[PDB]
Amino acid sequence: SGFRKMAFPSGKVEGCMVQVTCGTTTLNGLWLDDVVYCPRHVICTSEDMLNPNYEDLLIRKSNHNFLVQAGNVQLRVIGHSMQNCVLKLKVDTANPKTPKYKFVRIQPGQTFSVLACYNGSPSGVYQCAMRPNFTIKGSFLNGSCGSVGFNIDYDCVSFCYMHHMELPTGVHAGTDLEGNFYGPFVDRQTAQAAGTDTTITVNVLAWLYAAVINGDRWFLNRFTTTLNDFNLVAMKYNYEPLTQDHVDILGPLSAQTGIAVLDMCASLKELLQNGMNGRTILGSALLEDEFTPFDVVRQCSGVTFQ
Amino acid sequence: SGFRKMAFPSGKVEGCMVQVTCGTTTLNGLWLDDVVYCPRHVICTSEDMLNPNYEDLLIRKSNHNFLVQAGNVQLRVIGHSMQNCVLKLKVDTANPKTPKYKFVRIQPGQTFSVLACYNGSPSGVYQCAMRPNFTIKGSFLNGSCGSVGFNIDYDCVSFCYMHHMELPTGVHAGTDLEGNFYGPFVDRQTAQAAGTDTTITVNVLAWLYAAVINGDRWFLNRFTTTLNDFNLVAMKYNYEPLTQDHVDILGPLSAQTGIAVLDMCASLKELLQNGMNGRTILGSALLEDEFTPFDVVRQCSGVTF
Ligand SMILES: CC(C)(C)c1ccc(N(Cc2cc(Cl)cs2)C(=O)Cc2cncc3ccccc23)cc1
Ligand SMILES: CC(C)(C)c1ccc(N(Cc2cc(Cl)cs2)C(=O)Cc2cncc3ccccc23)cc1
């Protein structure tokens, strides 16, 4: 029993964190094979960040202007290039602790684990969701840039996030490991604002199934709904539209609990209309939307990573 | 900025997890130097669990009745002893991945990271508090027994918890790594229940200071309180007493924010009286009590390992 915000064990990614220094700017990099990945703004001064020309800034740097530390052991940079908003430093040494890995770009609604790092040392690990406005509600302090987000699937680490910036509301923005930003943001110090955020409907349904599996059933009801009628109500409360694909993905949880997806949709419709009436679900007074259907299955069926 | 329930990186503990099998029972063990630690109930049948005599059950075992697996590597057991409710299996090989470590017993209110494991493989990591009733609100399924709780300071892992059992409310009970149970619990399938749980007051105050540090002050008020008047009110909402020791521990956060401890106590009294009125504090509609004052400082000052 029990249901907790659960991160993947961080060990395989701990092996890959390094410190990258360029001038008086120190942040985190990700060392895989003979390449170190980090945000390209590492080459920028505070004054540079206002209107940076990254091509021109990089053209002026040599390999030896970049100090890479792996624990307290110096890696020699033998090459540098830019892919979109990430810097790739080629180093003389392949990382012996390099795990099996892919670079994956995730969809809004999908979750991942963050290894928060400072000076190339891991501080801590937590679970996050890519919001529909392409931001994450993280815990990052000055020096966290180059901290990575990952999912572990079977034997393989899937890196999906690199941290670049904090927005003025205190939410966070970054890229995939190919340097492509999630959301309509740029790596410049300029007025940038998170768009209006919505609730991740398929995840709230997943979390209601988690509640049922943990013996909390007060919200279930005799009513049903069509997909269309559910979406007409849900959109009024700033909930993402629920697709047929969402319904199919919730198939395994529906089968395990014996509650049809559209019956759980009918339960949610009444919760949105009526509220909770001062009751709670899995120790929360709000409807939680940062657990995916896979997250609920993994934690409720005890899948491990080796 | 931002504030999140944060576990310690689990790498140093991942290196130490093994599978222990005895008969039809498989659970997790902790391999440090040439010893494997696991719950002693590994030597029990389902029938054995109501009134086991562990001295009698253990004296009937040989070294080779214990199958220890570290990945694909069979470890040979060359000895076994019992310390309270943990089994210590002596193995032929010292763990090359053994970190610097200590065995510590924590107090109620203190937090730690859990590496949840099945068949000696890590599933997941989360942050926990030892509740005042000496239980933890974990996420553990059959096979999780021998999963460990830890705090990391510098390079040193301090192991404070081993998982033994699930209570009927769905909360969890276990031991320190000397085999002494937290609370009045025993390793028998006899009926035992969690005592009435209370809110960890000093941690709620710590978390209110975190909210201030992250630029949220809507919940503050013009009032103060005496310690005694705070405790008479907070006990009526099932909150732990706040001691002078608790007040002193909140000293650094009080100094950093310029909000006196008893002023924050006054704020908490009104939050319990009024609720949130459809607002949140650090993205929560409830008052969070699983962050210690040290946890708030660590996460707001960016400490690494
Ligand atoms: C390298 C230089 C000059 C040094 C630098 C680099 C990055 C930052 N910023 C601002 C921006 C980054 C992007 Cl990308 C667009 S604005 C940050 O957001 C850094 C940052 C990231 N995460 C959490 C933060 C918390 C506090 C302060 C800054 C934080 C500022 C200076
Ligand atoms: C060895 C044998 C038969 C194999 C065995 C060993 C232990 C268990 N128990 C019951 C107890 C443990 C303790 Cl200590 C007292 S009762 C558990 O509580 C296991 C357990 C732990 N954590 C989560 C659980 C969730 C569901 C079911 C059991 C869970 C049952 C069988």
Which amino acid would we find at residue B51?
N
Distance CA(A225)–CA(A201), nearest Å, equals: 15
B4 touches chain A (CB under 8 A): yes
Give the number of other Cβ atoms within 10 Å of residue A26's Cβ: 18
Q: Determine the length of chain B.
A: 305
- Closest residue by CA, ligand 1 atom 26: A142
Q: Select which of A145, A164, A172, A265 is catalytic.
A: A145
| Rounded Cα gap, residues B77 and B92, in angstroms | 7
Strands (E), chain B: 17-22, 25-32, 35-39, 66-70, 73-75, 77-83, 86-91, 101-103, 111-118, 121-129, 148-153, 156-166, 172-175
B214 neighbourhood in chain A, CB within 8 Å = 170
- Please give the Cα distance from B162 to B119 (Å, whole number): 15
DSSP H or E stretch at residue A288: none
Q: Output the ligand 1 site: residues, CB below 6 A.
A: A 25, 41, 44, 46, 49, 140-142, 144-145, 164-166, 187-189; B 1
Is residue A126 within 8 Å of A115, Cβ to Cβ? no
Phi, psi of A124 (to 5 degrees): 175, 165
Catalytic site includes residue B145: yes
**Which residues have a Cβ under 8 Å from the Cβ of A114 and sit 6 or more positions away?**
A7, A125, A126, A127, A128, A136, A138, A147, A148, A149, A161, A163
Contact yes or no for B107/B113 (Cβ under 8 A): no
Whether B17 contacts B117, CB under 8 Å: yes
Find, among A69, A86, A77, A66, the residue nearest to A19 by Cα: A69
Pairwise CA distance, residues B108 & B127, whole Å: 14
Ramachandran quadrant class, A228 (left: phi over 0; alpha: psi -120 to 50; beta: rest): alpha
Length of chain A: 306
Nearest CA owner, ligand 2 atom 30: B46
Which residue in the list B16, B41, B160, B172 is annotated as catalytic? B41
Report the 10 Å Cβ neighbour count for B168: 10
Q: Contact, A117 vs A144, CB < 8 A?
A: yes
- B39 neighbors B21 (Cβ within 8 angstroms): no
Element spanning A216, H or E: none
| Residue entry with tokens 């220890």 | B68
Resolution, Å (one decimal): 2.1
Distances (CA, A) of A92 to A21, A38, A71, A74, A79: 17, 17, 16, 10, 9
Q: How crowded is residue A14: how many other Cβ atoms within 10 Å of its Cβ?
A: 20
CATH of domain B201-301: 1.10.1840.10
Can you tell me the distance from the alpha carbon of A299 to that of A178, in angstroms, rounded to the nearest whole number? 30
CA nearest to A151 within chain B:
B124
Q: Is A305 on the interface with B (CB under 8 A)?
A: yes
Amino acid at B7: A
Q: Is the dihedral of CA B251, B254, B260, B263 positive or negative?
A: negative
Q: Give the contacts of B278 (CB within 8 A, at least 6 positions apart).
A: none
Please give the full DSSP string across A49-88, using - where no structure is assigned.
GGS--HHHHHHT--GGGEEEESSSSEEPEEEEEEETTEEE
CB nearest to A304's CB, from B119, B138, B286: B119
Q: Are B300 and B210 in contact (CB under 8 A)?
A: yes
Cβ of B21 less than 6 Å from ligand 2: no
Q: What letter does residue A180 receive in the DSSP assignment? A: P
Can you identify the CATH homologous superfamily of domain B11-91?
Trypsin-like serine proteases (2.40.10.10)
Displacement of CA A77 from its chain's centroid (Å): 29
H or E, element range at A123: strand A121-129
Query: In CATH terms, are A11-91 and A201-301 the same topology?
Result: no
Beta-sheet pairing, A121-129 with A101-103: unpaired
Residues A31 and A20: their CA atoms lie apart, in Å, by 10
Written as six digits, the tokens of B242 are 């706040």
Experimental method: X-ray
Distance of CA A21 to the CA centre of its chain: 25
Q: B293 and B257 in contact (C-beta within 8 Å)? A: no
Residue B160 makes CB contacts below 8 A (sequence gap 6+) with: B104, B105, B106, B110, B112, B149, B150, B151, B176, B177
Q: Which of B187, B162, B165 is nearest to B103 (CA)?
A: B162
CA A169 to chain CA centroid, Å, is 18
Tokens 């080796």 sit at which residue? Answer: A306
A146, A20 contact by CB (below 8 A): yes
Burial class of residue A64 in the structure, from the number of CB atoms within 10 Å of its CB (0-12 exposed, 13-18 middle, 19+ buried): exposed
Q: CB count, 10 Å around CB of B55?
A: 8
Contact A130, A261 (CB under 8 A): no
Tokens standing for residue B294: 């040290």
Sign of the Cα torsion B88, B93, B96, B97 reads negative
CA distances from A20 to A160, A172, B226 (A): 20, 21, 51
Is there a contact between A131 and A137 (Cβ–Cβ < 8 Å)? Answer: yes
Question: Which numbered ligand comes closest to the C-alpha of B40?
Answer: 2
Contact status, residue A98 vs residue A16, Cβ threshold 8 Å: yes
The closest alpha carbon to A272, from A215, A233, A216, belongs to A233
Q: What Cα–Cα distance (Å) separates residue B299 from each residue in A108, A164, B264?
A: 27, 19, 20
How many Cβ atoms sit within 10 Å of the Cβ of residue A231? 18
- Residue B236 near chain A (CB below 8 Å): no
- 3-class DSSP state for residue A170? coil
